[PDB]
Amino acid sequence: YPIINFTTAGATVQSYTNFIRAVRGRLTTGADVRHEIPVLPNRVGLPINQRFILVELSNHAELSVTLALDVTNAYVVGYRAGNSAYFFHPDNQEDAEAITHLFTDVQNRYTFAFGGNYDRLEQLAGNLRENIELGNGPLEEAISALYYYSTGGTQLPTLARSFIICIQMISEAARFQYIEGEMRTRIRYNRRSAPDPSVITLENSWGRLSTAIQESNQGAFASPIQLQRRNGSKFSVYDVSILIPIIALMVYRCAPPP
Amino acid sequence: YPIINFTTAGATVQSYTNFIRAVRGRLTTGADVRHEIPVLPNRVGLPINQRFILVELSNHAELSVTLALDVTNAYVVGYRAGNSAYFFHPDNQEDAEAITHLFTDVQNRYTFAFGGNYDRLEQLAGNLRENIELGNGPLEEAISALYYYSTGGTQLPTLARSFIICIQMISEAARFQYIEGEMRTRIRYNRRSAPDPSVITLENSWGRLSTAIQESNQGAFASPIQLQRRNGSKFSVYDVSILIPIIALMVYRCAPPP
Ligand SMILES: Nc1ncnc2[nH]cnc12
Numbered sequence: 001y002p003i004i005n006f007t008t009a010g011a012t013v014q015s016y017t018n019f020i021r022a023v024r025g026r027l028t029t030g031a032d033v034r035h036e037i038p039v040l041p042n043r044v045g046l047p048i049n050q051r052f053i054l055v056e057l058s059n060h061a062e063l064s065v066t067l068a069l070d071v072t073n074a075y076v077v078g079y080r081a082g083n084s085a086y087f088f089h090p091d092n093q094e095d096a097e098a099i100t101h102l103f104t105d106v107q108n109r110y111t112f113a114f115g116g117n118y119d120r121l122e123q124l125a126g127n128l129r130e131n132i133e134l135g136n137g138p139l140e141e142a143i144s145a146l147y148y149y150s151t152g153g154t155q156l157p158t159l160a161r162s163f164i165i166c167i168q169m170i171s172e173a174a175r176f177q178y179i180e181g182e183m184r185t186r187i188r189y190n191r192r193s194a195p196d197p198s199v200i201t202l203e204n205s206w207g208r209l210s211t212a213i214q215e216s217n218q219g220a221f222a223s224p225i226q227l228q229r230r231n232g233s234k235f236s237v238y239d240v241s242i243l244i245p246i247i248a249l250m251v252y253r254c255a256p257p258p
Numbered sequence: 259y260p261i262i263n264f265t266t267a268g269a270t271v272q273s274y275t276n277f278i279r280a281v282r283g284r285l286t287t288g289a290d291v292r293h294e295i296p297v298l299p300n301r302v303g304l305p306i307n308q309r310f311i312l313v314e315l316s317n318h319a320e321l322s323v324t325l326a327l328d329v330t331n332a333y334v335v336g337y338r339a340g341n342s343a344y345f346f347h348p349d350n351q352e353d354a355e356a357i358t359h360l361f362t363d364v365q366n367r368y369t370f371a372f373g374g375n376y377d378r379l380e381q382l383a384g385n386l387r388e389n390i391e392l393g394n395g396p397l398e399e400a401i402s403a404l405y406y407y408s409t410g411g412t413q414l415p416t417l418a419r420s421f422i423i424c425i426q427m428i429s430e431a432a433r434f435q436y437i438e439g440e441m442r443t444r445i446r447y448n449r450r451s452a453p454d455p456s457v458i459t460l461e462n463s464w465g466r467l468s469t470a471i472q473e474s475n476q477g478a479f480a481s482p483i484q485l486q487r488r489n490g491s492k493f494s495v496y497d498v499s500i501l502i503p504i505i506a507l508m509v510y511r512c513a514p515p516p
């Protein structure tokens with residue numbers, strides 16, 4: 001599986017931009033672009049040899065961790081830190097079988113009893129996304145927490161919080177240019193801040209937006225989608241046009257019509 | 259007023275393309291582009307010095323005629339052939355006054371008792387658009403008929419038919435890339451053929467399409483517009499997206515929203 005490397009040590013908006021750009025490039029084949037927006041591979045008929053990409057992250061403390069992303073939805077399915085590998089609870093047999101192909105070389109493979117959706121993760125972390133700061137500093141720390149979990153060094157709530165940080169700075173940033181932009185700003189000014197409503201609503205709406213665009217009438221949505229602005233004010237989306245500069249990738253929902 | 263020249267003598271799809279391209283360039287200022295489609299100047303506040311463009315047409319018989327197009331809608335308002343000038347009946351005082359600024363140098367200025375809309379013109383011609391052949395040959399002939407009207411040489415029905423030809427090959431071709439394309443084909447293969455339903459429906463719908471696009475919700479139409487394909491089958495338009503490659507210019511209907 002392809003491996004993309006990134007280090008928080010000395011990261012700049014350019015090193016981070018290049019990274020996210022490399023991830024998107026691995027995620028999509030370029031064979032399916034809907035209204036100028038690339039669509040991720042369809043899970044049906046996809047060979048395991050092309051099902052995952054690995055993201056090796058290192059930090060200033062020289063600790064390294066490798067995350068596995070599923071190509072069909074850009075989800076982090078598990079990670080590896082030295083000796084051991086940890087996987088979120090699979091939500092079906094196809095997926096349970098697919099992950100058996102990852103980190104086959106580790107001596108200790110563990111599968112959590114919980115899945116990786118935000119609801120579960122926030123419960124375990126004891127904090128919501130709106131309260132967890134994002135930025136290069138939080139990421140640097142997340143890499144170490146993830147690493148120390150394999151040594152009994154990290155607490156369950158810290159592990160959960162770390163995943164929340166990693167998932168938004170890697171998977172969500174790859175999905176939305178908007179979110180990647182929010183991250184670039186934090187890195188540029190060395191700011192560490194929790195995500196605003198615009199970010200959280202987009203994260204929550206990815207699956208629906210992907211469906212609405214793919215089932216739209218020449219780009220026109222059958223029913224509008226309510227999003228939130230940074231100030232929290234609601235904002236209705238009626239067309240794929242205003243989303244072209246916001247969403248970078250879509251999950252496959254249906255075949256394109258003639 | 260700017261003058262654009264075109265000759266049917268030895269015309270090629272390239273000489274015709276350059277011509278239509280020059281007309282569009284005179285018609286629009288470039289200050290108003292709605293969803294990638296240029297909008298014509300608003301009639302309110304437009305100075306007479308920038309209200310018209312002239313199109314001088316010549317043919318193989320060496321006859322010349324000059325048509326006046328109104329910049330706000332690309333309409334042919336009248337023409338000049340040597341000694342005399344003829345104007346369609348103005349449909350308001352603003353317009354009656356504006357045309358007093360055209361062909362001020364002719365010795366004989368006449369204003370028809372009828373206007374230039376297709377309904378009136380088809381009645382006078384004794385034939386509908388669907389029955390009047392378009393092409394370089396029909397245009398070559400139209401220029402002569404228009405010219406001979408000033409000498410008592412052209413019959414009223416032939417004059418009307420000639421205008422119908424001129425209006426579709428100049429004004430409608432400038433408004434729609436689709437119609438300009440239909441004309442290029444006729445010229446390329448030296449074909450002379452009446453317009454199909456796709457052409458006529460577009461001509462009929464220009465004002466509505468301009469309004470629907472300008473009042474759309476992020477490109478999404480509030481109510482769909484029914485057009486016809488070349489084979490006559492109906493086809494619904496729900497978004498401005500599929501029209502971007504079809505319509506070249508829009509008439510000003512409203513100011514653009516923030
Ligand atoms: N583990 C995960 N990977 C990607 N997107 C997610 N959204 C919530 N959990 C996720």
Ligand SMILES: Nc1ncnc2[nH]cnc12
Pocket residue numbers: 331332333334335374375376425429430
């Ligand atoms: N005289 C004219 N000029 C432009 N478009 C027209 N449509 C009908 N009559 C017209």
